[PDB]
Design a protein around this ligand. Structure first.
Ligand SMILES: COc1ccc(/C=C2\S/C(=N\c3cccc(C)c3)NC2=O)cc1O
Length: 328
């Protein structure tokens, strides 16, 4: 069978927390007053929820309300418990309230509001300095949640809310997040296709916080090279082929051989043989102002097949790429 794996950091955080910290199935939800919140505008819909701009009429402040679609009670409790555990942490979206929606007959999560700009428009304008700054802000959120025993598992541009006017960033959508427990096997049907780590694509279930670092590297690659998404697969099999055309097939085989993993035999006709590429190949006259030797080395250290070889969030914050970012 497969060789087991452990996180190289924050391995035992949940073991030594009180059980109530991670035992979300036992969590008792504290409900607020549903009439405190008046819906104003629908912002989006998905398979799991609908999201609205709203007003909190006890302070006349904007909030965001996520009205959950019917899903299993443990997954609702998991997201609620994670949001409560992380509340107040650096750049973590604040859960302000939880109320029972009378129409949906489901919980509605009330969040602080971010006056954000759309990433499809924001990424057109961010400077080299902007990208370094906001990457550092994301890392603060990821090191925090990892240090608190939680992996996000859905890092992608859509889940990073940026108020560019105030240089404010929030990591949102903790609905796929999980508590890390050493030796636990997790569902690989997490993250969006373009941000799925190799561990998910080869069906290796004993993964950890380092999944979020692959996803972050995918975001970084798309920003500095001006190609969004960077690894643009047509499905989950082609996604791994796209990765292998950049990182090469020999190191993919080294990865699965290390963990005594077999590829799906359907890769026999589609994977091919590919050398590992040098990152300079993706530099051109229209992105070179976003690229530096520091950026390429940082990217190279995030995008590793072996989840055990990727930079941790704290290690990433030590990288020379961030030396030019003004510290607070
Ligand atoms: C505009 O400011 C905000 C925008 C979103 C959030 C929090 C969210 S939105 C989410 N999930 C979805 C995202 C897109 C579509 C759908 C249906 C659900 N999960 C969260 O925590 C908080 C904000 O302040």
């Amino acid at each position: 069978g497969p060789v087991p794996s452990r996180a190289r950091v924050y391995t035992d955080v949940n073991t030594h927390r009180p059980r109530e910290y991670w035992d979300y199935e036992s969590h008792v939800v504290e409900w607020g007053n549903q009439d405190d919140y008046q819906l104003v505008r629908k912002l989006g819909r998905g398979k799991y929820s609908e999201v609205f701009e709203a007003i909190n009429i006890t302070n006349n402040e904007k909030v965001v309300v996520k009205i959950l679609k019917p899903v299993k009670k443990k997954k609702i409790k998991r997201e609620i418990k994670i949001l409560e555990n992380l509340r107040g942490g650096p750049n973590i979206i604040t859960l302000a309230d939880i109320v029972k929606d009378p129409v949906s007959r489901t919980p509605a999560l009330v969040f602080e509001h971010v006056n954000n700009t759309d990433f499809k428009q924001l990424y057109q304008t961010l400077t080299d300095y902007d990208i370094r700054f906001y990457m550092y802000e994301i890392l603060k959120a990821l090191d925090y949640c990892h240090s608190m025993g939680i992996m996000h598992r859905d890092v992608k541009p859509h889940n990073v809310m940026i108020d560019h006017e105030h240089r404010k960033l929030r990591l949102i959508d903790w609905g796929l997040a999980e508590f890390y427990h050493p030796g636990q096997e997790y569902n690989v049907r997490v993250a969006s296709r373009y941000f799925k780590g190799p561990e998910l694509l080869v069906d290796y279930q004993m993964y950890d916080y380092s999944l979020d670092m692959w996803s972050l590297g995918c975001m970084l690659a798309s920003m500095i090279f001006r190609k969004e998404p960077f690894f643009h697969g047509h499905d989950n099999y082609d996604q791994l082929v796209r990765i292998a055309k950049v990182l090469g097939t020999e190191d993919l085989y080294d990865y699965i051989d290390k963990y005594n993993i077999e590829l799906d035999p359907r890769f026999n006709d589609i994977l091919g043989r590919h050398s590992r590429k040098r990152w300079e190949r993706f530099v051109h006259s229209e992105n070179q102002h976003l690229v530096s030797p520091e950026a390429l080395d940082f990217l190279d250290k995030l995008l590793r097949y072996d989840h055990q070889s990727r930079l941790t969030a704290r290690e990433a914050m030590e990288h020379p790429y961030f030396y030019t970012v003004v510290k607070d």
